[PDB]
Amino acid sequence: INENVNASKSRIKDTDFAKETTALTKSQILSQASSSVLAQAKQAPNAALSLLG
């Protein structure tokens, strides 16, 4: 009962390193993708300077 209880606690509580490492890498790539888009967006109002205003 100790082993079967521990395995149940594994499926519920313990983390799946295969799935979590993939979720971490995906999150990082969206962190870099949002950062790059932010930089491109920061120059959006800079075009107003080209209007000589």
């Binding site: 969206l30 790059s36 888009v37 959006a44």
Partner: protein
């Protein structure tokens, strides 16, 4: 004829600049989010099926 009260070229360039800016804004949202379906405007039917999936 040359006139100063109105500028047809100015109105046309502004309109195409607002359309191009709208294309820039919708695109940059797609990369930052990672989804090409961020609102019902992009695809109403596609949003519904995607949420069901």
């Amino acid at each position: 004829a040359v006139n100063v009260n109105t500028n047809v070229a100015a109105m046309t360039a502004q309109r195409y600049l607002t359309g191009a800016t709208n294309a820039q804004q919708t695109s940059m949202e797609r990369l930052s989010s990672g989804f090409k379906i961020n609102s019902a405007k992009d695809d109403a039917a596609g949003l519904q099926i995607s949420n069901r999936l």
